[model samples]
Target: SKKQDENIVVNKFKPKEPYVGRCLLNTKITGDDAPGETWHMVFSTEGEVPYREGQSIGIVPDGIDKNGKPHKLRLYSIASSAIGDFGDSKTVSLCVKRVPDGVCSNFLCDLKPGSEVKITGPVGKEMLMPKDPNATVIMLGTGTGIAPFRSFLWKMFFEKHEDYQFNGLAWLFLGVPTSSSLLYKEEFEKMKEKAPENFRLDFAVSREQVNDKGEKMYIQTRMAQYAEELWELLKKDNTFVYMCGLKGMEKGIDDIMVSLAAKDGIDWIEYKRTLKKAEQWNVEVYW
Candidate 1:
């Protein structure tokens, strides 16, 4: 029941020796052709995690702040399952990118082989997904926002126990500046081999991507085109959605949702109401 057991204990995540791990490796995933740096950090922790799709865990690190006091709080999504990215033992991997002017991200990317770290719960009660196997879900994320979706995707493929299985469809849309910036490239493609229809992936590469009008590409550009299909999916009983990435992407995504509402003969008000009624639409914006 790992997929269904999503329990959280608030400050309970950080213990006395609640112990912290450090980054074990720092290597970019690409050469000259790559757009951004894909940094991998590994850590050792003792605990059991039961995170579902659309949920996030806060990675709290240990350190002193810029003010020169003890400050050790960093947040990153769990890119792999509760175990590890590739089912490795004794260590877990966290995939992170440096935000343009981010403090924690910058420090995290520079970590050496042995730097101590901390972590908090996969908290937030609002973090949840539709339990129905037939639920049609939309998983949208940009930049590092891809972390949680990766967990979601990994669950569908790797989290299988003796009796647990998903009968739903997970359509993941990942946005980055270029194709090379895409994480888990080969892995997600491999997932399709098992559940081709249950899982979907779309990439929005701003630099190399082009529009019919020849503009830079973003994720929502495709959303407008799939308006009808998305609407059809939402009319179902337990269809769900999770939005994570930049805080700014909401305005644009909301606009598309509202615009689609009008097309579906429902105004923005009704659209909001229905989302609440279904308790299926979840928004998790990152800072």
Candidate 2:
């Protein structure tokens, strides 16, 4: 069950009265061969917005909407740990893909260094990382959905924190259309090399990889390759699963688990509810 006193911070800066942050870095992290542009941006919060791993921050674009009102705030998951990208609490970051005709995304992607940006809220609690140092974390993400997982992995492997040292598995399955579209590839590869036993990484490049049956390798297909192992890990009480991406992936994961659970005469749907009740299943997905 969720702890009664989970230390989650929310609405430190609201939309109407947001923090004016400066854009420190805005660079394309994707390859030239990628289908679309995705950017990794860092903002100077100056330690004002205290946040945790898996929390999201809002961006209020500096423009009026089609209806002539100020553009509404759009939320993006914090792509940096609480210590942030520079190992200082003064910064916050985001991984964003420029969608076609997207108001806020385009505004964010085109931001220049030192540009003032309206920032609000280090919000959300459902996706918070478990405090247990020995807990197994299963992360499934696609595209910019990899945001929160980046924060979690940084804390787990990159940082040398005195209070927290992760000792258990941190498995990730990231899905992208092409290898060029893979975000933070080098950083994750380095972490894998540093902690091969504790950190496992898998990428499903739909345009470049295939399953045994010659099907395009999506996240669920790559995950299906280890269905039995995942099921075993999921059965453990100390295991937590986080799914972040398009909602369609949920059905695919369900398909993989339904049969595996049936082998043990268990109902996968019912078992998932138990996991949800125990706060072991966490999902933060969008369209």
Candidate 3:
């Protein structure tokens, strides 16, 4: 069988000469009791910046740094489907957390509707959604890292694309500090209700949930509960795994798989290399 190739698009807007977009929406997605604040914002691109699911866009915050130089652009994963949040091709969206003293993040989170924002490249291809409708996709993410997966799931369950119909299993594992911090909870729940057989959602609320061992339920710990089943899925040729979020998350997953793969006398690291080489394993993470 021929493998499906990624559809990577060229950057229409570069850092030097960026596109000017207007913020159409900006709202807090987190609850008051959450550890931090996260905002979901949408900007009008007027269909000029054609981007696909899992790609990232650059935002150039207004004003200069303390050194009096212009602030650098920050990249954020697109949080909407190709058709966008409004089911129109005229906009793009982002899910961002207000990092302490984070210039770009604070600027993005403070954006008001109709505010002009400098925008650049809809770059990145590593996290692009697979074209195979029947491909089993496993997504692991934490906090705001849920950005790209939102785009993937939206395409998979929320929107109807005439060119692409998802008939596969999309299992998502999201880790957050608390239940109130669970970004896009309502939307994901609605998706599960719409396609229970094709979609699976799991949340690892470290502060609110615990495991049998009384350990905090982090993403990997939660996944460890289903390690055997995950290992079986990993063995399948049609299964693909995509991980995003902090770099440490990948290490945690490796730790879980190491012991499990050892049960079958397989070197998990080497096996993972094969998966990466075949594009069955994809990752996009930040510090």
Most lDDT-accurate candidate? 2
lDDT of 3 at 138: 95
- On the 0 to 100 scale, the lDDT of residue 45 in model 3 is 93
lDDT of 2 by residue, 1-287 (tens): 33212656799999889999999999999999899999999999999998899899999999997788988998899999989999979999999999898999999999999999999997788888887888999999998889999999999999998878999999999999999999999989999999999999999998999999999999989998999899989989889899987777788878888999999999999999999889899899876
The parts of candidate 3 lying over 4 Å away from their true place are 1-7
Any residue pairs clashing in model 2, and if so which? none
Model 2's TM-score against the true structure: 0.97
Rank by lDDT, highest first. 2, 3, 1
Pairs that collide, model 1: 15-18, 60-118, 133-167, 133-168
For model 1, what is the error of residue 162's alpha carbon versus the real structure, in angstroms, after optimal superposition? 3.0
What are the runs in model 2 whose C-alpha is more than 4 Å off?
1-6
Q: Of models 1 and 2, which has the larger lDDT? A: 2
The residue-by-residue lDDT of candidate 3 on 130-153, one tens digit each, is 778889999999987899999999
Q: Number of clashes in model 1?
A: 4
As a whole number from 0 to 100, the lDDT of residue 230 in candidate 2 is 94
Scored by CA lDDT, what does every candidate get? 0.67, 0.91, 0.89
